[PDB]
C-alpha cells in the first residue's frame, strides 16, 4: 500500500523515505541526515527525537 504523506520537519522534503525516521512519541518525521547529531542508519527498536526522549 501507499506511504503516508509525511515530510521531514527539518528540510520539508518527503524524499528518501527509507531514511525518514518517525518519532515514537510526537510522530514527526526527521531524515537521518537532517538530525543533529547525524544518524548513520535506522536505529533498532523504538526511537525518540530530541524533544521526546525525556
Amino acid at each position: 500500500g501507499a506511504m503516508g504523506s509525511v515530510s521531514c520537519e527539518e528540510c520539508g522534503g518527503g524524499h528518501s523515505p527509507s531514511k525518514l525516521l518517525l518519532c515514537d512519541k510526537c510522530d514527526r518525521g526527521y531524515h537521518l541526515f537532517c538530525l543533529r547529531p547525524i544518524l548513520p542508519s535506522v536505529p533498532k527498536g523504538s526511537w525518540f527525537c530530541p524533544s521526546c526522549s525525556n
Binding site: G1, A2, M3, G4, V6, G14, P17, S18, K19, L20, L21, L22, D24, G29, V42, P43, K44, G45, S46, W47
Partner: peptide, 11 residues
C-alpha cells in the same frame, strides 16, 4: 524504528 518507507499497509 519506524520510517516513512515502513509506514504503509502491505496486504
Amino acid at each position: 524504528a519506524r520510517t516513512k518507507q515502513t509506514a504503509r499497509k502491505s496486504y
